[PDB]
Amino acid sequence: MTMMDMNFKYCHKIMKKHSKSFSYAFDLLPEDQRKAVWAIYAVCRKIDDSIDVYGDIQFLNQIKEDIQSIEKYPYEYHHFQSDRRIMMALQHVAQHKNIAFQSFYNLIDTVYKDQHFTMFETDAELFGYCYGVAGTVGEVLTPILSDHETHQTYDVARRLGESLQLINILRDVGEDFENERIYFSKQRLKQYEVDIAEVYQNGVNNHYIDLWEYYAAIAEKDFRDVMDQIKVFSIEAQPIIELAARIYIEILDEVRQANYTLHERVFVEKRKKAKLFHEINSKY
Ligand SMILES: O[C@]1(c2ccc(-c3ccccc3)cc2)CN2CCC1CC2
């Protein structure tokens, strides 16, 4: 085990802990590709959690300066300000892959903004947020998951990211509400006559279910479009990306099965993930 192995194993630990689904799928990649995914994923996770370290932007600005160091001097030795292990691994990735740094910076700006969170007026703003927080992650992963990147590769990977985020939102309505977040748009909440606080207090009803299903059908159509364009990705990543996605699409059924509850986080059992992999592994 080298020092660099240790940095990657740490990145792996961050990804497994926070997402058993993506870990389950992406750990099936060939060794150099999965390690690159762990490092990008861990960086993104550190960005998402940065504000809560002290309670302000300090740690986030240090991550950003780390990433800028890597971009400007990819082969120089850096004394990293934030998480050294993760930044050494990201730097190692960047020496082998064309990383879209502006995509990390977009993610970072979305985090800064999310400090003065106000609800989205319209769905267009919600979809902007899904880009910021998750389409950006798809962009950064693109060179890892595909042999030759075109605008279409980025477009697909970006749409996949945003569709996964929409599914997250639909899974976490109640938990987000507790943390003073609602991600459904004001336009759409008014249209369907739905008040999240009221639903959190009194349970689901037909209006909420219609609103929830409105968004679920968006996520599902987007997912179908990604699946139909799966060939943009490397041959080894295709089944894995299909699995990651299918596991996530299954979250929607878990929600309906639990009657759209706002008081627990539903999940797709590990044994179910393995069933979907069998279904897919056959096709490939
Ligand atoms: O977990 C994030 C994420 C979302 C989407 C993809 C993705 C994965 C594969 C392809 C495209 C995107 C990765 C990570 C990272 N972070 C901000 C948003 C969510 C929650 C915390």
Curated annotation (Swiss-Prot):
Cite the entry's keywords alphabetically: Carotenoid biosynthesis, Magnesium, Metal-binding, Transferase, Virulence
Q: Which GO terms describe its molecular function?
A: geranylgeranyl diphosphate synthase activity; metal ion binding; squalene synthase [NAD(P)H] activity
Cite the binding residues for Mg(2+) 1. 48, 52
Cofactor(s) for this UniProt protein: Mg(2+)
Any one biological process term the GO annotation gives: carotenoid biosynthetic process
Entries under Gene3D superfamilies matching the protein:
Farnesyl Diphosphate Synthase (1.10.600.10)
Does the keyword field hold Magnesium?
A: yes
Which reaction does this enzyme catalyse, per its entry?
2 (2E,6E)-farnesyl diphosphate = 15-cis-4,4'-diapophytoene + 2 diphosphate
The name this protein goes by in its record: 4,4'-diapophytoene synthase
Q: Which organism is it from?
A: Staphylococcus aureus
